[PDB]
């Protein structure tokens, strides 16, 4: 909110747009400011009608630019992400830094949720701790980012008609008040409502089922319909599931899975999509292909 601080934040955003990382002290200051900003949102986030919804990015920074080119620049176009910024990518640090900087700089225009991969255990199992070690020489920036990930809001609510979340519903959750009652200022547990909100998936089995991934549950069309009718919702936007077309409609068009990382892991070769909500809350899907690539040390060296 202060003049020179905002100018420095704009400089940081411009530098990040060139796929350039920030210094450790800069990351520390940005993480502290982001923690102060995010400490004052509830578990559910109120988002206005005109906003663009994007799914998992997973550290593909050039792909995120391509997404920005497709959907408009960050300040001009309202955006809403539902997690999974750092894993399975070669620029996870840059991706999370850019997204968090946008959240700090444009808090009324950028709304970033919490995905299952923004947790200490998963980010240690997969390649973000190693990525941070390679890019910084120590494990301080990783600690800052993991601590910041705790304060991220679990879900978001746009115009009180659309429910935005990463994983899906839980057997122990049935009402937005119950979602509000949860405590999110902690590492995600191995089980419970908070873990279930970020790890669940939809299927065509009906009722609550065991998740093959190892955490969360699987909810059916009946569960989605009763949740929608109880909470007065017409659409539940979700992520965390890979889809070839980029977007997928399930459970009689009650939930939608949006994936914004085409050519997943640079191996899948899929397409992506984003959800644009206009003034009258009419959804539109834009599909885009991965950005073209131009410009084509021992592990014990330290």
């Amino acid at each position: 909110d202060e003049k020179v601080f905002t100018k420095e934040l704009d400089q940081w955003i411009e530098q990040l747009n060139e796929c350039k990382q920030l210094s450790e002290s800069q990351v520390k200051s940005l993480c502290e400011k982001a923690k102060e900003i995010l400490t004052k949102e509830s578990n559910v986030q109120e988002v206005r009608c005109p906003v663009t919804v994007c799914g998992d990015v997973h550290g593909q920074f050039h792909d995120l630019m391509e997404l920005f080119r497709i959907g408009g620049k960050s300040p001009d176009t309202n955006y809403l992400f539902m997690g999974d910024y750092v894993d399975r990518g070669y620029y996870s640090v840059e991706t999370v830094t850019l997204l968090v900087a946008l959240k700090v700089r444009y808090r009324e225009r950028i709304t970033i949720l919490r995905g299952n991969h923004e947790s200490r255990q998963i980010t240690q199992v997969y390649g973000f701790y190693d990525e941070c070690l390679r890019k910084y020489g120590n494990a301080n920036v990783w600690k800052y980012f993991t601590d910041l990930f705790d304060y991220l809001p679990l879900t978001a609510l746009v115009d009180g008609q659309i429910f935005c979340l990463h994983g899906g519903l839980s057997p122990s959750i049935d009402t937005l008040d119950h979602i509000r009652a949860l405590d999110r200022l902690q590492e995600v547990p191995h089980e419970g409502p908070m873990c279930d909100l970020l790890w669940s998936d939809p299927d065509d089995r009906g009722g609550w089922g065991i998740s093959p991934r190892g955490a969360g549950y699987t909810f059916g069309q009946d569960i989605s319909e009763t949740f929608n009718h109880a909470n007065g919702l017409t659409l539940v936007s979700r992520a965390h599931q890979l889809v070839m077309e980029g977007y997928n409609w399930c459970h009689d068009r009650n939930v939608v899975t949006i994936f914004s990382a085409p050519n997943y892991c640079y191996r899948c070769g899929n397409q992506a999509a984003i959800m644009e909500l206009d003034d009258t809350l009419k959804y539109s899907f834009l599909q885009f292909d991965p950005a073209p690539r131009r410009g084509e040390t021992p592990d014990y060296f330290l």
Partner: peptide, 11 residues
């Protein structure tokens, strides 16, 4: 010990 990895946790 000489070839101990420092940027590869699985290694």
């Amino acid at each position: 010990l000489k070839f101990w990895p420092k940027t590869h946790s699985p290694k």
